[PDB]
Amino acid sequence: RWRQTWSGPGTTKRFPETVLARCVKYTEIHPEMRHVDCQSVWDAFKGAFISKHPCDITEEDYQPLMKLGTQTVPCNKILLWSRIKDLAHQFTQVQRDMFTLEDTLLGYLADDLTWCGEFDTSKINYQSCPDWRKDCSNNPVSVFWKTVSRRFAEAACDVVHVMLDGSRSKIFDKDSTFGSVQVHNLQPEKVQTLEAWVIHGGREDSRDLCQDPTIKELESIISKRNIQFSCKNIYRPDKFLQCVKNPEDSSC
Ligand SMILES: Nc1nc2c(c(=O)[nH]1)N1CN2[C@@H]2O[C@H](COP(=O)(O)OP(=O)(O)OC[C@H]3O[C@@H]1[C@H](O)[C@@H]3O)[C@@H](O)[C@H]2O
């Protein structure tokens, strides 16, 4: 076919088998989830979007899945990020200093996948799925990430960290999930401080990106929520990871 229904990529090939297998793997490794029934998880996940119009998805659709995937993460060790997922993952994998959504069953199941169905058939659409921008915002993937991302921010306490991509024209982007959902769902009763680590992408010696107008904007928003804001430059992320791995290194 030379023209698809929607503008976005279709469902990831073998989506059902992949989600099920990820659930088996995650629950084998993480003892706190060792009792989860992975068939039930898949059934709830499918139930969120199968036979539903893929521009008419709501947070309620995912509630059965959210309930089954209920999981505590150490509230004071949460790492959020925007446009720099790979460094976040590389850092937490060293010694589990912090936790991202992929450390949770639900984030692990969905990471890097795309999915959608069709109104009034029970088929998965492997050909195309709605684009957030061109087609609709209330699509299966966008709604999933909005819901689980809000819930993760709500779980945080004490000091919460965020890695930001300092090579972007908007280092803090109010339109990102971090900026539009997570910033507004940190609970001021519980969260003392948001600390941003601004990750440099460029040459070597460079600017203090903690003075960037978008970072001043983030500071202003967070501060007006009665949460303290702190920011640090990470000038050389390669050195940073080396120091996390081997902190006795003289150059650290
Ligand atoms: N696999 C994951 N994806 C996402 C997570 C997440 O935790 N894992 N997300 C979001 N997300 C989706 O991935 C793209 C790119 O985000 P990208 O544009 O790079 O950054 P965002 O700030 O939109 O989203 C990152 C922020 O929300 C959670 C995670 O806890 C981070 O603190 C965009 O559609 C997001 O909604």
XYZ file of C-alpha atoms and ligand atoms in Angstrom:
288
model
C 0.000 0.000 0.000
C 1.207 3.402 -1.108
C -0.707 5.488 1.475
C -1.288 4.622 5.140
C -4.151 5.728 7.356
C -1.953 7.572 9.829
C 1.278 9.575 9.684
C 3.207 7.696 12.398
C 5.148 4.408 12.321
C 2.982 1.324 12.885
C 3.031 -1.121 15.803
C 6.426 -2.670 16.577
C 6.625 -6.119 14.950
C 5.666 -8.986 17.306
C 4.484 -6.468 19.926
C 2.436 -9.011 21.971
C 5.278 -11.545 22.201
C 7.776 -8.760 23.036
C 5.724 -7.233 25.853
C 5.006 -10.695 27.346
C 8.673 -11.688 27.206
C 9.833 -8.380 28.739
C 7.359 -8.979 31.567
C 8.715 -12.506 32.162
C 12.288 -11.219 32.141
C 11.650 -8.205 34.393
C 9.734 -10.299 36.953
C 12.512 -12.957 36.988
C 15.166 -10.339 37.810
C 13.314 -8.062 40.240
C 12.095 -9.938 43.330
C 9.623 -7.248 44.352
C 7.645 -8.019 41.167
C 8.246 -11.816 41.130
C 4.546 -12.519 41.787
C 3.110 -10.468 38.916
C 1.064 -12.570 36.464
C 2.413 -11.620 33.057
C -0.600 -12.903 31.149
C -2.749 -10.560 33.281
C -0.381 -7.707 32.514
C -0.580 -8.308 28.751
C -4.380 -8.645 28.924
C -4.637 -5.291 30.732
C -2.192 -3.624 28.335
C -4.127 -4.915 25.289
C -7.373 -3.887 26.920
C -6.194 -0.235 27.001
C -6.134 0.138 23.187
C -7.537 -2.895 21.305
C -10.890 -2.276 19.614
C -10.626 1.409 20.506
C -10.261 4.355 18.141
C -6.535 5.276 18.347
C -7.358 9.010 18.579
C -9.700 8.474 21.515
C -7.513 6.989 24.225
C -7.745 8.189 27.826
C -5.766 7.708 31.011
C -8.682 5.576 32.310
C -7.958 3.084 29.533
C -4.610 2.311 31.182
C -5.855 2.094 34.775
C -6.103 -1.746 34.839
C -2.482 -1.872 33.598
C -1.337 0.755 36.134
C -2.910 -1.207 38.979
C -1.211 -4.453 37.950
C 2.078 -2.608 37.531
C 1.921 -0.900 40.971
C 5.516 -0.708 42.200
C 7.478 1.250 44.802
C 10.736 2.906 43.783
C 13.007 4.597 46.403
C 11.386 8.029 46.424
C 14.588 9.975 47.099
C 16.567 8.421 44.227
C 14.467 9.287 41.164
C 16.185 10.462 37.951
C 14.138 12.293 35.344
C 15.546 13.373 31.953
C 14.740 15.236 28.780
C 16.346 14.485 25.371
C 19.207 12.507 26.965
C 17.809 9.017 27.825
C 20.989 7.116 26.918
C 23.255 8.881 29.433
C 20.578 8.500 32.098
C 20.489 4.753 31.541
C 24.273 4.407 31.300
C 24.639 6.237 34.628
C 22.006 4.278 36.593
C 23.382 0.950 35.276
C 26.788 1.438 36.942
C 25.660 0.841 40.542
C 21.956 1.757 40.639
C 22.589 5.144 42.284
C 19.226 6.324 40.909
C 16.130 5.006 39.152
C 14.477 5.950 35.870
C 11.128 4.735 34.516
C 12.964 1.773 32.823
C 13.828 0.463 36.230
C 10.096 -0.055 36.751
C 8.049 -2.857 35.189
C 5.838 -0.495 33.155
C 8.670 1.621 31.695
C 10.675 -1.496 30.874
C 7.698 -3.097 29.076
C 7.002 -0.069 26.841
C 10.494 1.337 26.214
C 11.168 2.062 22.468
C 7.921 0.349 21.328
C 5.002 1.714 19.324
C 1.448 0.279 19.342
C -2.117 1.045 18.298
C -5.372 -0.708 17.336
C -8.486 0.095 15.306
C -12.032 1.066 16.166
C -14.361 -1.959 16.091
C -11.887 -4.621 15.061
C -9.593 -6.347 17.510
C -6.558 -6.129 15.215
C -3.251 -4.473 16.034
C -2.306 -1.900 13.388
C 1.155 -2.822 12.183
C 0.981 -0.411 9.226
C 0.665 3.029 10.865
C -0.272 4.727 14.122
C -1.292 8.320 14.832
C 1.417 10.988 14.912
C 1.080 13.221 18.028
C 1.526 16.357 15.935
C -0.172 15.626 12.622
C -2.965 13.289 13.728
C -3.890 13.424 17.426
C -2.420 13.718 20.897
C -4.769 11.142 22.512
C -3.141 8.118 20.880
C -2.120 4.865 22.664
C 1.606 5.642 22.989
C 1.324 9.341 23.920
C -1.383 8.704 26.494
C 0.651 5.840 28.047
C 3.761 7.998 28.473
C 1.837 10.965 29.838
C 0.159 8.776 32.462
C 3.193 6.771 33.663
C 5.431 9.905 33.531
C 3.018 11.857 35.789
C 2.823 8.918 38.219
C 6.621 8.669 38.387
C 6.969 12.396 39.221
C 4.246 12.018 41.883
C 6.321 9.267 43.535
C 9.380 11.444 44.109
C 10.516 12.940 47.412
C 13.546 14.746 48.914
C 16.010 15.629 46.118
C 14.899 14.703 42.574
C 17.435 14.881 39.737
C 16.920 15.715 36.065
C 19.430 15.308 33.217
C 18.962 17.898 30.435
C 20.569 18.001 26.984
C 22.674 21.194 26.883
C 23.124 20.945 23.089
C 19.410 21.630 22.424
C 18.222 25.104 21.461
C 15.792 24.817 24.404
C 17.723 23.049 27.192
C 14.554 23.145 29.236
C 11.567 22.774 26.948
C 8.149 23.521 28.458
C 6.564 21.378 25.723
C 8.519 18.204 26.652
C 7.036 15.538 28.947
C 9.482 16.603 31.618
C 8.412 20.266 31.297
C 4.681 19.913 30.628
C 3.867 16.990 32.956
C 6.635 16.099 35.436
C 7.575 19.604 36.675
C 3.921 20.223 37.535
C 3.436 16.902 39.313
C 6.335 16.839 41.775
C 4.636 17.089 45.154
C 5.780 20.169 47.029
C 4.852 18.586 50.366
C 7.500 15.855 49.752
C 10.077 17.231 47.254
C 12.698 19.500 48.760
C 14.768 20.234 45.671
C 14.902 19.649 41.923
C 18.550 19.418 40.814
C 19.271 19.714 37.093
C 22.438 18.321 35.552
C 22.941 20.129 32.236
C 24.858 17.801 29.941
C 27.267 19.500 27.557
C 27.543 18.230 23.977
C 30.067 20.594 22.454
C 33.830 21.062 22.423
C 35.565 21.273 25.716
C 35.738 24.462 27.634
C 32.368 26.149 27.399
C 29.611 28.301 28.900
C 27.871 28.118 32.217
C 24.634 26.649 30.846
C 23.044 26.924 34.284
C 22.623 30.611 33.270
C 20.669 29.741 30.120
C 17.329 31.623 29.881
C 15.391 28.326 29.734
C 17.169 27.157 32.917
C 16.237 30.478 34.629
C 12.668 29.737 33.447
C 12.755 26.255 34.990
C 14.148 27.737 38.203
C 11.322 30.267 38.282
C 8.560 27.705 37.738
C 9.959 25.251 40.325
C 10.562 27.992 42.901
C 7.003 29.290 42.554
C 5.801 25.755 43.387
C 7.677 25.999 46.765
C 10.446 23.624 45.675
C 14.140 24.629 45.699
C 16.148 24.537 42.481
C 19.806 23.599 42.010
C 21.779 23.227 38.765
C 25.180 21.797 37.790
C 27.068 21.641 34.494
C 28.414 18.307 33.343
C 31.000 19.523 30.880
C 32.389 16.119 29.837
C 29.856 13.316 30.149
C 32.546 10.788 29.211
C 34.637 11.857 32.240
C 31.503 11.871 34.360
C 30.728 8.217 33.599
C 34.359 7.268 34.136
C 34.284 8.918 37.551
C 31.055 7.107 38.471
C 32.654 3.803 37.523
C 36.059 4.537 39.068
C 35.788 7.473 41.534
C 39.331 7.021 42.898
C 40.607 8.125 39.453
C 42.977 11.046 40.088
C 41.272 13.152 37.402
C 37.919 12.961 39.221
N 11.015 5.188 27.093
C 10.657 6.273 27.792
N 10.048 7.295 27.141
C 9.688 8.388 27.844
C 9.945 8.496 29.198
C 10.554 7.424 29.862
O 10.777 7.440 31.092
N 10.914 6.319 29.135
N 9.476 9.713 29.646
C 8.949 10.311 28.548
N 9.078 9.509 27.469
C 8.660 9.782 26.079
O 9.784 9.592 25.236
C 9.718 10.561 24.162
C 11.055 11.286 24.119
O 11.249 12.098 25.290
P 12.158 13.419 25.226
O 11.636 14.405 24.196
O 13.604 13.096 25.078
O 12.011 14.051 26.713
P 10.600 14.301 27.460
O 10.969 15.291 28.541
O 9.439 14.509 26.504
O 10.317 12.938 28.262
C 11.292 12.452 29.231
C 10.708 12.427 30.655
O 9.391 11.804 30.734
C 9.498 10.382 30.992
C 10.834 10.224 31.721
O 10.588 9.955 33.124
C 11.598 11.548 31.545
O 11.846 12.246 32.794
C 8.526 11.467 24.443
O 7.380 11.037 23.666
C 8.230 11.228 25.908
O 6.851 11.338 26.298
